[PDB]
Design a protein around this ligand. Structure first.
Ligand SMILES: O=C1NCC2(CCNCC2)c2[nH]c(-c3ccnc(-c4ccc5c(c4)OCO5)n3)cc21
Length: 272
């Protein structure tokens, strides 16, 4: 009930880790390069930011969200001089299980889709409960821990993350959060059929809310699931479902009762 604060080291990371050049990705702040712990031989990944009140916010918001099982753990944060300017080196747990849809791409059922959505939801539920929005919940930022079947799906990259701030008093007497709820709707839409609900012109279709549940990809999918997507992909954010309501929806709470109906998502993804 009282977790430690960010220790934030000052000594060189070259002392503790052997920094290689095997890049795991790029993105919103800087590339992620793999390192190795010199004591043991464990992997870990290194994200590299330059020190400036903004990247120093990311490390702070990530550290709070890190206590959640479905968010990448940051193992240590270093403050070093790279080249000749202040930098924040974030050391995170290794996630070599691939991206969410990279796994799916090689049966896959609605139940499996339901279970995945609960994991992503638990990360968002924790973020919102402590007043944090992710603002960039996309397929690329959702990575598995290992290749083993049973690995935990974790949310990553807090670069766009921002803080959102009697017994009878109302909540408004005390909307970046809704942004994430749209995202879950997109992720859930792609999880069920294998393609996104909007593509190309496209900018207009996203504003209008013009999408379909076409056959054959949605033929087997229930109206209960379609209506859940409708209430996540609303044009008006205040008309949109909240994370507490999402986690209390029967399709998410009882992932086990959801039938093992086969989806096209594996085959559809396979064709680029
Ligand atoms: O902050 C991050 N921003 C963006 C990405 C995810 C979207 N694609 C570009 C990199 C990212 N990925 C990671 C990350 C965190 C922990 N582990 C790994 C990782 C480790 C080994 C891997 C791997 C990913 O994929 C290949 O083998 N990546 C952090 C970030």
């Amino acid at each position: 009930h009282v977790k430690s604060g960010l220790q934030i080291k000052k000594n060189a990371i070259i002392d503790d880790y052997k920094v290689t050049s095997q890049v795991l990705g790029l993105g919103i702040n800087g590339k992620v390069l793999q390192i190795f712990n010199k004591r043991t031989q464990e992997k870990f990944a290194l994200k590299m930011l330059q020190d400036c009140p903004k990247a120093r916010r990311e490390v702070e918001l990530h550290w709070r969200a890190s206590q959640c099982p479905h968010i990448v753990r940051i193992v240590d944060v270093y403050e070093n001089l790279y080249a000749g300017r202040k930098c924040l080196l974030i050391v995170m747990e290794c996630l070599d299980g691939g991206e969410l849809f990279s796994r799916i791409q090689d049966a896959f059922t609605e139940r499996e889709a339901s279970e995945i959505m609960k994991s992503i939801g638990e990360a968002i539920q924790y973020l919102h409960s402590i007043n944090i929005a992710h603002r960039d919940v996309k397929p690329e930022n959702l990575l598995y821990t290992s290749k083993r079947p049973n690995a935990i799906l974790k949310l990553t990259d807090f670069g766009f993350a921002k803080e959102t701030t009697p017994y009878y008093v109302a909540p408004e007497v005390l909307y970046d959060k809704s942004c994430d709820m749209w995202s879950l709707g997109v992720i859930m839409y792609i999880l069920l059929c294998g393609y996104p609900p909007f593509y190309s012109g496209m900018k207009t279709r996203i504003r209008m809310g013009q999408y379909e549940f076409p056959n054959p990809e949605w033929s087997e999918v229930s109206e209960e699931v379609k209506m859940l997507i409708r209430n996540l992909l609303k044009t008006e954010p205040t008309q949109r479902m909240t994370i507490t309501e999402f986690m209390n929806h029967p399709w998410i709470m009882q992932s086990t009762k959801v039938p093992q109906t086969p989806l096209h998502t594996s085959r559809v993804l396979k064709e680029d």
